[PDB]
Amino acid sequence: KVFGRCELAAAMKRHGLDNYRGYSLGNWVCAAKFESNFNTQATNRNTDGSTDYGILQINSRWWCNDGRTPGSSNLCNIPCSALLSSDITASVNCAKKIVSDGNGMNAWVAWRNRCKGTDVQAWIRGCRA
């Protein structure tokens, strides 16, 4: 599924991301835009052999099991394929574990490079609300 900007903001809010660990909703919407262009089916393979999955590009080195990343953990206790669902529950639950790991949203490279320090409230502007 390809979310609309406000549709995703609403789904994230419902799932408890607004101000989670102090990150306002616009941060999460900005991170999803630049990691996946709001597409739940996005995948990208990394040079180390791990793959990133879903709307928040969650990595198989640490967080999910895809059966093809030998050095790896599955800290979210889920198949990586679950992160590709039209239902973002699995992604959000895993993202909450990631953001609590010590580096905050810096875990997401696109957030650090494209959202951090910018006017992120613009991402929820106009949404109901």
Curated annotation (Swiss-Prot):
Record: residues binding substrate: 101
Disulfide bonds: 6-127, 30-115, 64-80, 76-94
Tissue expression notes: In the egg white and polymorphonuclear leukocytes.
Entry keywords, A to Z: Allergen, Antimicrobial, Bacteriolytic enzyme, Disulfide bond, Glycosidase, Hydrolase, Secreted, Signal
One Pfam short name: Lys
Annotated Gene3D superfamilies: 1.10.530.10
GO molecular function: beta-N-acetylglucosaminidase activity; identical protein binding; lysozyme activity
InterPro entries on file: Glyco_hydro_22 (IPR001916), Glyco_hydro_22_CS (IPR019799), Glyco_hydro_22_lys (IPR000974), Lysozyme-like_dom_sf (IPR023346)
Database matches in PANTHER family: LYSOZYME C (PTHR11407:SF28)
Protein name (database record): Lysozyme C
